[PDB]
Design a protein around this ligand. Structure first.
Ligand SMILES: *C(=N)[C@H](C[C@@H]1CCNC1=O)NC(=O)[C@@H]1[C@@H]2[C@H](CN1C(=O)[C@@H](NC(=O)C(F)(F)F)C(C)(C)C)C2(C)C
Ligand SMILES: *C(=N)[C@H](C[C@@H]1CCNC1=O)NC(=O)[C@@H]1[C@@H]2[C@H](CN1C(=O)[C@@H](NC(=O)C(F)(F)F)C(C)(C)C)C2(C)C
Lengths: 305, 305
């Protein structure tokens, strides 16, 4: 028993981190086989970042201008190209620690682990959700760019995020590993802001199931609701609409606990309308929305990699 | 910016996990050089666990009865001994992935990362504090025993915890890597309970400094207090006494922010007496006590390993 915010084991990703320096700008890169992936603004000076023409800046670079270091070993760069907001450096050595991997683009509401790195070296690992406004609530400093987010499935690392920038209120934005931003953001140092966020309803429901599994059942009421009636009530509280796809994904937790999804919805509705009356659920005084249904099943069933 | 509960990168520890089976009991072991460390109740049947005589049970075992698997490779056991509540299996192969390491016994209030494992394979990583009642608030299922807790310092893994058991209310107990339990617990399936816990005051103060660093400053008041007066007030709210050692360890955060420790204490005193008035600090509606001063400095300064 117990329920904690839990990251994937980071070792397979640690074996892929390198540092990339161009001029006096240094950030992190991801070394998979004989390619290093990193944010394209490694080619910018501080002044360039205010309004960069990345294509122009990259024209003026050649392979040898990129100093790629894997530990204290320099990796010779033998080619380069830009794909959207990511630079791809071909090196003459394939990474022997390359895991089985995929590049995926995740959906708002899905979670992933972040290996926060500086100068090619890992600092820590934490779990994040892609918010509905396409930011993540991360923890990043100067030099963190190129840190990646990922999920693991058995032996396969699915990379889904590369870190690029911090937005007002201390939230974070980046790209998939093809260099395409999540959300309407651009990699330029000019005023940008995320839109209003929303609460990930299906994840709150997943976490209420986690609570029941752990014996924290006080909030279960005796009622049911329709999906329509739930979504009308949830809308007022800035909860995203619960879809039938969401109901279907909650099925395994529903079947395990014997609580119908729409009965859980009736209990959540009462929590939204009435509050928690000073009580906690799984030790939290707020409803938690950064555990997916699969996160709950992995943790409570002991899925390994 | 941003502040998250953050674990150490787990790769160095992942390379040390194996599975240990004796009879039909399987749990995790830690393989360092040519020794595997694991909980001694691997030698118990379910019935033995109700009242085990470990010395007697181990007399009846020989080396070959221990099936140690590192992936799909069996490690031949060539010796064994018991040290307190840990079994040490000497194997004929040294682990080539052994990191620089130490065995340490940590103090209540200190934090560590847990790599939760099943059948020798990692499931996830999360951060925990050794509570003042010598339990941890973990997340563990059947088969998790032998999972370890650790801190990293540059290249050196300090192992501080091995998981053995779950106590009432879903909290957890275990040993250091010399097999000595934290707290008054024994590895026997008989009713045991932790004593009343207390809040780790120095960690709450550290986290309030983390909040100021991130710009969450609303709770700063205009007052100071004496250490004596603070500790009288904190006692009522089941906060542990703040010592001069604690004040000294908070020094770097105090100097960085320009807020004297005793001025922070005056702000915490007001939070304890008045509550948070429905507000959050770093997104939490409760005061958080599982970040140490060094945890705050590592995360906000980007310390790497
Ligand atoms: C990569 N190493 C950093 C990570 C930042 C630094 C502080 N916390 C982080 O996550 N990325 C940058 O510094 C990027 C980069 C130029 C400026 N930048 C920002 O993150 C800035 N944000 C914005 O300009 C805004 F608001 F649009 F997101 C900054 C004000 C420095 C936080 C480029 C090329 C976007
Ligand atoms: C190791 N694989 C398990 C981990 C447990 C299992 C459920 N969650 C966990 O953390 N350790 C055990 O099953 C140990 C073990 C016998 C019984 N045990 C317990 O954890 C039991 N707890 C107690 O007996 C109590 F309350 F004293 F802590 C159990 C009721 C199964 C949770 C031995 C040898 C102590």
């Amino acid at each position: 028993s117990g329920f904690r915010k839990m990251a994937f084991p980071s070792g397979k990703v640690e074996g892929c981190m390198v540092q990339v320096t161009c001029g006096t700008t240094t950030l992190n890169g991801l070394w998979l086989d004989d390619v290093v992936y990193c944010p394209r603004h490694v080619i910018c000076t501080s002044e360039d970042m205010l309004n960069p023409n990345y294509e122009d800046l990259l024209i003026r670079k050649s392979n040898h201008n990129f100093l790629v270091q894997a530990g204290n070993v320099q990796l010779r760069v033998i080619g380069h190209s830009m794909q959207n907001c990511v630079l791809k450096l071909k090196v003459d050595t394939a990474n022997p620690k390359t895991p089985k991997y995929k590049f995926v683009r995740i959906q708002p509401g899905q979670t992933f682990s972040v290996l926060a790195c500086y100068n090619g070296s890992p600092s820590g690992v934490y779990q994040c959700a892609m918010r509905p406004n396409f930011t993540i609530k991360g923890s990043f400093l100067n030099g963190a760019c190129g840190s990646v987010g990922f999920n693991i499935d058995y032996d396969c690392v699915s990379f889904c995020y590369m870190h690029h920038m911090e937005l007002p209120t201390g939230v974070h934005a980046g790209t998939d590993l093809e260099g395409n931003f999540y959300g309407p953001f651009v990699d330029r140092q000019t005023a940008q802001a995320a839109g209003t966020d929303t609460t990930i309803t299906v994840n709150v429901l997943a976490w209420l199931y986690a609570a029941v599994i752990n014996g924290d059942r006080w909030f279960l009421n005796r009622f049911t609701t329709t999906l329509n009636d739930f979504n009308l009530v949830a809308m007022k509280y800035n909860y995203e609409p619960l879809t039938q796809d969401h109901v279907d994904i909650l099925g395994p937790l529903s079947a395990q606990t014997g609580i119908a999804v729409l009965d859980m919805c009736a209990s959540l509705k009462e929590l939204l309308q009435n509050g928690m009356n000073g009580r906690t659920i799984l030790g939290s005084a707020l409803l938690e929305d950064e555990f997916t249904p699969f996160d709950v099943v992995r943790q409570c069933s002991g899925v390994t990699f």
